[PDB]
Write a protein of this length. Structure first.
Lengths: 217, 217
């Protein structure tokens, strides 16, 4: 509860050091941002006092540094892939995915079957079109299958945490040399991991485990 | 290592609160005690700087408060017993303890057998005499057996972490009413638990366990 926080924050703040100057600068950016409302927003955010806020900022900055250091050169190389465009149909039942594949193999419209049967509300009204996306945008299971396809090829059912996908590859962009794009791949992985609560929390559990400490969620 | 310390100290210092005024007073008592040598003794003690020392004093005072609160009214009542005097012979082999008992039952001298066979160097040259002691002075196994004896009675072999004891009760003091001596029993348990590293460390492991945290020694 309040103890887990202290400990979890102590492990991160001790390993990923940030200067009090950097912490105080982030604190001042919040004071000028709200002014005389600082106490209210601080109260409304459920913070004891300014000391609690500072400790929460120290944690955020240390966590940000930890997420930035979590990106290895191997991680950057593992995301060096061409941007691809694909369509998909998502269903929860594996037999339903096999029956969808059977219909597409006969010539049935991929777009119309996606509009009727896909469970993916973000793409079903576009006939299953996901548009162009980079490596790391979709689930690893989906990505692994999509990059194995040839343009126009339809996958067999692909299991992912979201259900079963029938995937059609529809586009592949030219890829610039690694040295030309590696800085941008690293920036993208840094941002995606920082904006992902699931990653930042799995990183905390692993960090406590590396320190030989077992706690409850 | 250095992380276990931080965490172990954070759990105790958070639960058993001590004022910064009390901590600073203990720090100043050390400064006037050594004067210009403070840095050297601090360096010789293996302390980073004065901040490290203060955190170690904060821990000591919080631990002292935790040990003082570990003494319950039940603990005081469990130590309300007359001071007793006993002699003993300590041997490591249970058959040797049975053979010693057989000899004493025939009339053999307890004092001479203790001088020859006892492994307890603190009492063997006194013929096994431990003098008068209060509840909590000896191991619970030894104490439990000693208080069951009648004056002059010899025990069968009593197993303790030290080996096997043959115990003879030789004295028992009058006991004042509980209300008259309970303050002194509490003071004695506070002091014995504070001067005992084994207790202070078993108290830390239990405190981490109450907080649902598993760490390695």
């Amino acid at each position: 509860d309040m103890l887990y926080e202290m400990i979890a924050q102590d492990v991160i703040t001790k390993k990923y050091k940030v200067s009090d100057d950097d912490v105080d600068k982030e604190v001042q950016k919040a004071k000028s941002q709200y002014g005389d409302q600082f106490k209210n927003v601080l109260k409304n955010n459920g913070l004891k006092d300014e000391a609690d806020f500072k400790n929460q900022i120290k944690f955020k900055l240390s966590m940000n540094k930890a997420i930035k250091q979590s990106v290895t050169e191997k991680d950057v190389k593992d995301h060096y892939k061409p941007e691809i465009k694909a369509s998909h149909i998502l269903v929860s039942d594996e037999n339903e995915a096999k029956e969808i594949k059977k219909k597409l193999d006969t010539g049935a419209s991929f777009e119309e079957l996606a509009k009727q049967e896909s469970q993916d509300l973000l793409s079903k009204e576009k006939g299953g079109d996901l548009g162009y996306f980079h490596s790391g945008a979709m689930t690893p299971e989906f990505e692994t299958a999509a990059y194995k396809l040839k343009i126009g090829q339809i996958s067999d059912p692909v299991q992912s945490p979201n259900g079963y996908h029938i995937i059609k590859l529809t586009g592949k962009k030219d890829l610039k040399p690694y040295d030309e794009v590696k800085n941008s791949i690293r920036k993208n992985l840094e941002e995606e991991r920082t904006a992902d609560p699931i990653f930042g929390k799995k990183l905390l559990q692993s960090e406590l485990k590396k320190a030989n400490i077992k706690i409850n969620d």
